[PDB]
């Protein structure tokens, strides 16, 4: 017997929400208890609209845009219990309409654009228990209307335009339990704004404009939860929580808090959370005596000088303990905290770790000591610890590292200790799965668990097994050294053994020969180092890169290259002059060797030493060193090569000098040929979109760089007819 | 790469995906993740551990400002039993370049910029929703 | 176009921003999770206003059907009594034909 417009459900309940009816449907049984006619367009309520509804108990009018209600429309409802008018356009409080309700228990009046309330409202409601009045345009708390509701238990006034609360605004609300007043324009509360609320258990004042901590909370003996976050409160003096002994949760985050009282958290027993951040003007640790059930304790951005020793003895229930961004000097003994699991001590000034600083812990799992300036660690500091998975000790000044009793570790971080030049044993970290060390050569020992991580990522330029590499490069470098060391010496002996006075033409050849002898000495040093340690290199890399041997070899290499290119350019210019100046070429040559000294003197005295590879060469292998030096070097070498080619062309554009001219042309061509590939590989990743594996680059640099030192004397020994007669004078000797 | 291989049998569904993951290897099952769900107010369901969360991002032009940084976004996800985290930038390549490109975190972060990964999101739609196992790469 | 009751609709993850007078609920299926504007929260949830965007939130008190807030209930199951927002097997210290007890 249910009208279609409103098909029914049953159980003496009729649901007709979202039908668009302009009036209450007729023909419904008078025995119905709950009716739902929400989501319609009923704008006017006629007189005696509910004439045929004597047994109504529940009614809803959600989303109807109701405007006017007749004063006698609600008459005859003697059994209504729940009436909800939730999103509408009432724009007022129908005090006269709801005057006839006596058994009502709940009432919703949220989001109705109510701006005014009659003084005689809320009369006759002797059984009301809930009241919603949020999301309106109220300007003041209706103290007078609310005085006629002694049975109220819940009340909310959120999202309004309230700016202040007068005294005794809730004097007759003797049974209030929860009150919400968040999202308003509250800025000043009187000292007696909460008098009479003897059963209050929850108060909310979030998202307001409070600038001072309210002192009126001392009249709330039954308060359990209090939250005042998202405000402008900065001072919490002593005694702020003396009248609320039964507090459980306090929210004070997202505020410009700077000062907290020394004894502002005493005698609180049921509290189990305490997070304070930004307390930049706090010098003493808070007096937590009397609190024995606390679970977490976070204090960051403070100036705490020391930690009390009775932290783990007074009470043992803490699970986390974070003390980052402080100035703690020494670590008190942590014996007593049996249930403690996580300890964070990032960014502090702790000196060292005593013999038994961590002795006695049985459940520590995550530990962090990053950026704390730790000097020495005791051998048995971690012996007593049990199952620990994370241990982060990074950016410190450690010199040694204990390893006993660390079988269960899964993440060790020691990236930053440049003084840790020793090697860590790999037989005590079976379960390790993510490690990070300061130097690349220390990962060689670790490289059926997955592969461990290595932050330096030692590879082709950081060899582990063999310095040079394959079996061919060793033979190549051996051949280059054995040829250069003898041929350069033979040329030097032949040239400067006939007479003191020599033509300037047959001069530069001897100086070029001397520069080639210095490059061969550098290659011999490299091959001797490679041969000394063939099977193992991970144990000698640190002593080589961080010692005092790499820089000498580097100084020798830079000096040889710069001297070769400058002398070749000067020889080209001198031959260009000829077509009488013998009193200055010698001075020009002397000024040139100094050029190479300044060249190599620089990458040494400069802080950015080129030691990314054990070879110690200027050619770039990464962005870590000073790239400017390489760019400068490569730019200067390219300019010199372009000037020599032009002058000799001009020379070729337009006797015995023919042999000397041919010899000089062959030398400059050979030097130019074996320099382009190195320059191209120097800045290839910088501009070109194609990447090249470092192994190929390392092999090309090893082969083509010392090659000119071997190629220069062999041409002179064979081609120049002068050498064919030079030994004639040496034979007599 | 997020290889498409589901617990229900399917052909050519091996290597059924090929993707990109600029900040470790791990394998587990994929779960959706509404964008507004990664916020502090949102209730943490924590249904069961061992899952991969897939989050799809809409267009930031018609979109108002996010609740938190894509940074804290991935971070919080970590806590969730979801052991892996992917991010969709098809209608947002600014999310591709977002925050510190480096993973200050470690829970593998894998954006996609996928022109076929949105095709794979249509797969996550599927006709049988998912019950689909997941492969990293 | 745009889904009904939603003003920022998407066909990939669902609605983004509903009407200013309506709530959004994150209704998650076995695989996916879609937000779905709705006039009122389901009985297991409670309303939560916010100037930016509203949202329904689950309650943290057991044996409660509908709850005023996260720290208050108004209707338990057909069974144990209710006292100042807490559902208890017996009326504690209240000496309490309604299932109400106080």
PDB file of N, CA and C in Angstrom, chain A residues 102-170:
ATOM      1  N   UNK A 102       8.623  18.014  22.514  1.00  0.00           N
ATOM      2  CA  UNK A 102       9.000  17.735  23.893  1.00  0.00           C
ATOM      3  C   UNK A 102       9.824  16.469  24.064  1.00  0.00           C
ATOM      4  N   UNK A 103       9.693  15.520  23.165  1.00  0.00           N
ATOM      5  CA  UNK A 103      10.437  14.271  23.247  1.00  0.00           C
ATOM      6  C   UNK A 103      11.642  14.242  22.316  1.00  0.00           C
ATOM      7  N   UNK A 104      12.005  15.375  21.736  1.00  0.00           N
ATOM      8  CA  UNK A 104      13.138  15.419  20.823  1.00  0.00           C
ATOM      9  C   UNK A 104      14.441  15.170  21.572  1.00  0.00           C
ATOM     10  N   UNK A 105      15.334  14.398  20.963  1.00  0.00           N
ATOM     11  CA  UNK A 105      16.629  14.080  21.550  1.00  0.00           C
ATOM     12  C   UNK A 105      17.814  14.560  20.727  1.00  0.00           C
ATOM     13  N   UNK A 106      17.677  14.701  19.432  1.00  0.00           N
ATOM     14  CA  UNK A 106      18.751  15.180  18.576  1.00  0.00           C
ATOM     15  C   UNK A 106      18.194  16.206  17.600  1.00  0.00           C
ATOM     16  N   UNK A 107      19.043  17.157  17.221  1.00  0.00           N
ATOM     17  CA  UNK A 107      18.645  18.210  16.297  1.00  0.00           C
ATOM     18  C   UNK A 107      19.870  18.702  15.544  1.00  0.00           C
ATOM     19  N   UNK A 108      19.787  18.670  14.219  1.00  0.00           N
ATOM     20  CA  UNK A 108      20.872  19.127  13.361  1.00  0.00           C
ATOM     21  C   UNK A 108      20.439  20.389  12.630  1.00  0.00           C
ATOM     22  N   UNK A 109      21.230  21.453  12.723  1.00  0.00           N
ATOM     23  CA  UNK A 109      20.963  22.726  12.064  1.00  0.00           C
ATOM     24  C   UNK A 109      22.235  23.270  11.431  1.00  0.00           C
ATOM     25  N   UNK A 110      22.978  22.408  10.759  1.00  0.00           N
ATOM     26  CA  UNK A 110      24.248  22.793  10.163  1.00  0.00           C
ATOM     27  C   UNK A 110      24.051  23.264   8.728  1.00  0.00           C
ATOM     28  N   UNK A 111      24.766  24.298   8.349  1.00  0.00           N
ATOM     29  CA  UNK A 111      24.778  24.840   6.991  1.00  0.00           C
ATOM     30  C   UNK A 111      23.378  25.271   6.548  1.00  0.00           C
ATOM     31  N   UNK A 112      22.835  26.249   7.262  1.00  0.00           N
ATOM     32  CA  UNK A 112      21.534  26.822   6.940  1.00  0.00           C
ATOM     33  C   UNK A 112      21.588  28.333   6.762  1.00  0.00           C
ATOM     34  N   UNK A 113      22.784  28.900   6.691  1.00  0.00           N
ATOM     35  CA  UNK A 113      22.963  30.343   6.520  1.00  0.00           C
ATOM     36  C   UNK A 113      22.225  31.129   7.602  1.00  0.00           C
ATOM     37  N   UNK A 114      22.259  30.611   8.818  1.00  0.00           N
ATOM     38  CA  UNK A 114      21.612  31.275   9.944  1.00  0.00           C
ATOM     39  C   UNK A 114      22.512  32.404  10.428  1.00  0.00           C
ATOM     40  N   UNK A 115      21.967  33.625  10.458  1.00  0.00           N
ATOM     41  CA  UNK A 115      22.708  34.787  10.922  1.00  0.00           C
ATOM     42  C   UNK A 115      22.160  35.389  12.205  1.00  0.00           C
ATOM     43  N   UNK A 116      20.920  35.066  12.556  1.00  0.00           N
ATOM     44  CA  UNK A 116      20.312  35.594  13.768  1.00  0.00           C
ATOM     45  C   UNK A 116      19.581  34.476  14.493  1.00  0.00           C
ATOM     46  N   UNK A 117      19.469  34.630  15.793  1.00  0.00           N
ATOM     47  CA  UNK A 117      18.775  33.652  16.626  1.00  0.00           C
ATOM     48  C   UNK A 117      17.836  34.385  17.577  1.00  0.00           C
ATOM     49  N   UNK A 118      16.570  34.043  17.620  1.00  0.00           N
ATOM     50  CA  UNK A 118      15.656  34.687  18.568  1.00  0.00           C
ATOM     51  C   UNK A 118      16.063  34.409  20.008  1.00  0.00           C
ATOM     52  N   UNK A 119      15.780  35.387  20.876  1.00  0.00           N
ATOM     53  CA  UNK A 119      16.150  35.252  22.280  1.00  0.00           C
ATOM     54  C   UNK A 119      15.350  34.158  22.976  1.00  0.00           C
ATOM     55  N   UNK A 120      14.107  33.951  22.560  1.00  0.00           N
ATOM     56  CA  UNK A 120      13.241  32.951  23.167  1.00  0.00           C
ATOM     57  C   UNK A 120      13.353  31.587  22.496  1.00  0.00           C
ATOM     58  N   UNK A 121      14.473  31.307  21.849  1.00  0.00           N
ATOM     59  CA  UNK A 121      14.660  30.031  21.181  1.00  0.00           C
ATOM     60  C   UNK A 121      15.014  28.940  22.190  1.00  0.00           C
ATOM     61  N   UNK A 122      14.940  27.685  21.725  1.00  0.00           N
ATOM     62  CA  UNK A 122      15.318  26.512  22.516  1.00  0.00           C
ATOM     63  C   UNK A 122      14.517  26.423  23.813  1.00  0.00           C
ATOM     64  N   UNK A 123      13.196  26.657  23.719  1.00  0.00           N
ATOM     65  CA  UNK A 123      12.301  26.572  24.864  1.00  0.00           C
ATOM     66  C   UNK A 123      11.457  25.310  24.764  1.00  0.00           C
ATOM     67  N   UNK A 124      11.326  24.602  25.882  1.00  0.00           N
ATOM     68  CA  UNK A 124      10.547  23.386  25.940  1.00  0.00           C
ATOM     69  C   UNK A 124      11.306  22.119  25.614  1.00  0.00           C
ATOM     70  N   UNK A 125      12.559  22.209  25.172  1.00  0.00           N
ATOM     71  CA  UNK A 125      13.375  21.041  24.844  1.00  0.00           C
ATOM     72  C   UNK A 125      14.006  20.522  26.129  1.00  0.00           C
ATOM     73  N   UNK A 126      13.262  19.662  26.863  1.00  0.00           N
ATOM     74  CA  UNK A 126      13.712  19.125  28.142  1.00  0.00           C
ATOM     75  C   UNK A 126      14.373  17.762  28.005  1.00  0.00           C
ATOM     76  N   UNK A 127      14.436  17.210  26.797  1.00  0.00           N
ATOM     77  CA  UNK A 127      15.027  15.895  26.584  1.00  0.00           C
ATOM     78  C   UNK A 127      16.099  15.897  25.500  1.00  0.00           C
ATOM     79  N   UNK A 128      16.539  17.073  25.055  1.00  0.00           N
ATOM     80  CA  UNK A 128      17.555  17.137  24.014  1.00  0.00           C
ATOM     81  C   UNK A 128      18.897  16.652  24.546  1.00  0.00           C
ATOM     82  N   UNK A 129      19.631  15.940  23.708  1.00  0.00           N
ATOM     83  CA  UNK A 129      20.951  15.438  24.072  1.00  0.00           C
ATOM     84  C   UNK A 129      22.055  15.814  23.096  1.00  0.00           C
ATOM     85  N   UNK A 130      21.746  16.163  21.869  1.00  0.00           N
ATOM     86  CA  UNK A 130      22.747  16.560  20.890  1.00  0.00           C
ATOM     87  C   UNK A 130      22.259  17.795  20.149  1.00  0.00           C
ATOM     88  N   UNK A 131      23.206  18.589  19.651  1.00  0.00           N
ATOM     89  CA  UNK A 131      22.872  19.817  18.936  1.00  0.00           C
ATOM     90  C   UNK A 131      24.007  20.172  17.990  1.00  0.00           C
ATOM     91  N   UNK A 132      23.704  20.221  16.689  1.00  0.00           N
ATOM     92  CA  UNK A 132      24.652  20.641  15.667  1.00  0.00           C
ATOM     93  C   UNK A 132      24.314  22.056  15.216  1.00  0.00           C
ATOM     94  N   UNK A 133      25.286  22.955  15.287  1.00  0.00           N
ATOM     95  CA  UNK A 133      25.104  24.325  14.821  1.00  0.00           C
ATOM     96  C   UNK A 133      26.336  24.832  14.084  1.00  0.00           C
ATOM     97  N   UNK A 134      27.096  23.919  13.444  1.00  0.00           N
ATOM     98  CA  UNK A 134      28.311  24.313  12.752  1.00  0.00           C
ATOM     99  C   UNK A 134      27.999  24.835  11.352  1.00  0.00           C
ATOM    100  N   UNK A 135      28.993  25.510  10.777  1.00  0.00           N
ATOM    101  CA  UNK A 135      28.922  26.032   9.411  1.00  0.00           C
ATOM    102  C   UNK A 135      27.748  27.000   9.241  1.00  0.00           C
ATOM    103  N   UNK A 136      27.813  28.118   9.982  1.00  0.00           N
ATOM    104  CA  UNK A 136      26.817  29.174   9.882  1.00  0.00           C
ATOM    105  C   UNK A 136      27.546  30.513   9.879  1.00  0.00           C
ATOM    106  N   UNK A 137      26.783  31.602   9.975  1.00  0.00           N
ATOM    107  CA  UNK A 137      27.320  32.957   9.967  1.00  0.00           C
ATOM    108  C   UNK A 137      27.065  33.654  11.297  1.00  0.00           C
ATOM    109  N   UNK A 138      27.200  32.906  12.391  1.00  0.00           N
ATOM    110  CA  UNK A 138      27.014  33.490  13.711  1.00  0.00           C
ATOM    111  C   UNK A 138      28.164  34.430  14.050  1.00  0.00           C
ATOM    112  N   UNK A 139      27.869  35.434  14.866  1.00  0.00           N
ATOM    113  CA  UNK A 139      28.862  36.406  15.300  1.00  0.00           C
ATOM    114  C   UNK A 139      29.153  36.359  16.792  1.00  0.00           C
ATOM    115  N   UNK A 140      28.279  35.742  17.583  1.00  0.00           N
ATOM    116  CA  UNK A 140      28.495  35.640  19.018  1.00  0.00           C
ATOM    117  C   UNK A 140      27.840  34.365  19.529  1.00  0.00           C
ATOM    118  N   UNK A 141      28.299  33.922  20.662  1.00  0.00           N
ATOM    119  CA  UNK A 141      27.760  32.706  21.272  1.00  0.00           C
ATOM    120  C   UNK A 141      26.398  33.024  21.884  1.00  0.00           C
ATOM    121  N   UNK A 142      25.346  32.305  21.518  1.00  0.00           N
ATOM    122  CA  UNK A 142      24.028  32.570  22.112  1.00  0.00           C
ATOM    123  C   UNK A 142      23.939  32.074  23.546  1.00  0.00           C
ATOM    124  N   UNK A 143      24.426  32.903  24.485  1.00  0.00           N
ATOM    125  CA  UNK A 143      24.466  32.487  25.885  1.00  0.00           C
ATOM    126  C   UNK A 143      23.054  32.297  26.428  1.00  0.00           C
ATOM    127  N   UNK A 144      22.179  33.287  26.186  1.00  0.00           N
ATOM    128  CA  UNK A 144      20.828  33.224  26.743  1.00  0.00           C
ATOM    129  C   UNK A 144      20.013  32.047  26.218  1.00  0.00           C
ATOM    130  N   UNK A 145      19.913  31.802  24.901  1.00  0.00           N
ATOM    131  CA  UNK A 145      19.098  30.659  24.452  1.00  0.00           C
ATOM    132  C   UNK A 145      19.563  29.319  24.996  1.00  0.00           C
ATOM    133  N   UNK A 146      20.861  29.143  25.150  1.00  0.00           N
ATOM    134  CA  UNK A 146      21.389  27.856  25.585  1.00  0.00           C
ATOM    135  C   UNK A 146      21.174  27.586  27.067  1.00  0.00           C
ATOM    136  N   UNK A 147      20.690  28.566  27.825  1.00  0.00           N
ATOM    137  CA  UNK A 147      20.481  28.378  29.255  1.00  0.00           C
ATOM    138  C   UNK A 147      19.294  27.477  29.569  1.00  0.00           C
ATOM    139  N   UNK A 148      18.457  27.125  28.581  1.00  0.00           N
ATOM    140  CA  UNK A 148      17.275  26.301  28.788  1.00  0.00           C
ATOM    141  C   UNK A 148      17.485  24.855  28.354  1.00  0.00           C
ATOM    142  N   UNK A 149      18.735  24.370  28.319  1.00  0.00           N
ATOM    143  CA  UNK A 149      19.064  23.002  27.916  1.00  0.00           C
ATOM    144  C   UNK A 149      19.934  22.366  28.991  1.00  0.00           C
ATOM    145  N   UNK A 150      19.349  21.937  30.119  1.00  0.00           N
ATOM    146  CA  UNK A 150      20.144  21.314  31.187  1.00  0.00           C
ATOM    147  C   UNK A 150      20.571  19.887  30.888  1.00  0.00           C
ATOM    148  N   UNK A 151      19.974  19.231  29.897  1.00  0.00           N
ATOM    149  CA  UNK A 151      20.270  17.839  29.587  1.00  0.00           C
ATOM    150  C   UNK A 151      21.207  17.680  28.396  1.00  0.00           C
ATOM    151  N   UNK A 152      21.799  18.770  27.913  1.00  0.00           N
ATOM    152  CA  UNK A 152      22.692  18.689  26.768  1.00  0.00           C
ATOM    153  C   UNK A 152      23.981  17.963  27.136  1.00  0.00           C
ATOM    154  N   UNK A 153      24.508  17.208  26.177  1.00  0.00           N
ATOM    155  CA  UNK A 153      25.744  16.464  26.396  1.00  0.00           C
ATOM    156  C   UNK A 153      26.783  16.773  25.325  1.00  0.00           C
ATOM    157  N   UNK A 154      26.341  17.080  24.128  1.00  0.00           N
ATOM    158  CA  UNK A 154      27.235  17.368  23.015  1.00  0.00           C
ATOM    159  C   UNK A 154      26.795  18.643  22.314  1.00  0.00           C
ATOM    160  N   UNK A 155      27.778  19.447  21.937  1.00  0.00           N
ATOM    161  CA  UNK A 155      27.508  20.698  21.244  1.00  0.00           C
ATOM    162  C   UNK A 155      28.714  21.061  20.393  1.00  0.00           C
ATOM    163  N   UNK A 156      28.452  21.460  19.151  1.00  0.00           N
ATOM    164  CA  UNK A 156      29.504  21.862  18.229  1.00  0.00           C
ATOM    165  C   UNK A 156      29.144  23.193  17.586  1.00  0.00           C
ATOM    166  N   UNK A 157      30.141  24.078  17.493  1.00  0.00           N
ATOM    167  CA  UNK A 157      29.972  25.398  16.892  1.00  0.00           C
ATOM    168  C   UNK A 157      31.155  25.703  15.979  1.00  0.00           C
ATOM    169  N   UNK A 158      31.528  24.717  15.149  1.00  0.00           N
ATOM    170  CA  UNK A 158      32.690  24.865  14.289  1.00  0.00           C
ATOM    171  C   UNK A 158      32.335  25.613  13.007  1.00  0.00           C
ATOM    172  N   UNK A 159      33.372  26.203  12.396  1.00  0.00           N
ATOM    173  CA  UNK A 159      33.257  26.899  11.114  1.00  0.00           C
ATOM    174  C   UNK A 159      32.209  28.014  11.175  1.00  0.00           C
ATOM    175  N   UNK A 160      32.488  28.997  12.047  1.00  0.00           N
ATOM    176  CA  UNK A 160      31.626  30.167  12.167  1.00  0.00           C
ATOM    177  C   UNK A 160      32.458  31.442  12.169  1.00  0.00           C
ATOM    178  N   UNK A 161      31.821  32.592  12.429  1.00  0.00           N
ATOM    179  CA  UNK A 161      32.498  33.882  12.491  1.00  0.00           C
ATOM    180  C   UNK A 161      32.632  34.385  13.926  1.00  0.00           C
ATOM    181  N   UNK A 162      32.749  33.464  14.881  1.00  0.00           N
ATOM    182  CA  UNK A 162      32.881  33.846  16.281  1.00  0.00           C
ATOM    183  C   UNK A 162      34.271  34.414  16.527  1.00  0.00           C
ATOM    184  N   UNK A 163      34.342  35.501  17.281  1.00  0.00           N
ATOM    185  CA  UNK A 163      35.604  36.151  17.598  1.00  0.00           C
ATOM    186  C   UNK A 163      35.933  36.185  19.083  1.00  0.00           C
ATOM    187  N   UNK A 164      34.954  36.085  19.958  1.00  0.00           N
ATOM    188  CA  UNK A 164      35.201  36.114  21.393  1.00  0.00           C
ATOM    189  C   UNK A 164      34.102  35.337  22.102  1.00  0.00           C
ATOM    190  N   UNK A 165      34.413  34.932  23.326  1.00  0.00           N
ATOM    191  CA  UNK A 165      33.490  34.167  24.153  1.00  0.00           C
ATOM    192  C   UNK A 165      33.282  34.923  25.460  1.00  0.00           C
ATOM    193  N   UNK A 166      32.066  35.329  25.812  1.00  0.00           N
ATOM    194  CA  UNK A 166      31.825  36.033  27.074  1.00  0.00           C
ATOM    195  C   UNK A 166      31.878  35.084  28.263  1.00  0.00           C
ATOM    196  N   UNK A 167      31.932  35.698  29.451  1.00  0.00           N
ATOM    197  CA  UNK A 167      31.977  34.926  30.685  1.00  0.00           C
ATOM    198  C   UNK A 167      30.669  34.175  30.908  1.00  0.00           C
ATOM    199  N   UNK A 168      30.772  33.003  31.462  1.00  0.00           N
ATOM    200  CA  UNK A 168      29.617  32.177  31.821  1.00  0.00           C
ATOM    201  C   UNK A 168      28.719  31.913  30.616  1.00  0.00           C
ATOM    202  N   UNK A 169      29.313  31.628  29.464  1.00  0.00           N
ATOM    203  CA  UNK A 169      28.551  31.336  28.256  1.00  0.00           C
ATOM    204  C   UNK A 169      27.872  29.975  28.312  1.00  0.00           C
ATOM    205  N   UNK A 170      28.311  29.091  29.180  1.00  0.00           N
ATOM    206  CA  UNK A 170      27.761  27.746  29.318  1.00  0.00           C
ATOM    207  C   UNK A 170      27.526  27.425  30.787  1.00  0.00           C
TER     208      UNK A 170
END
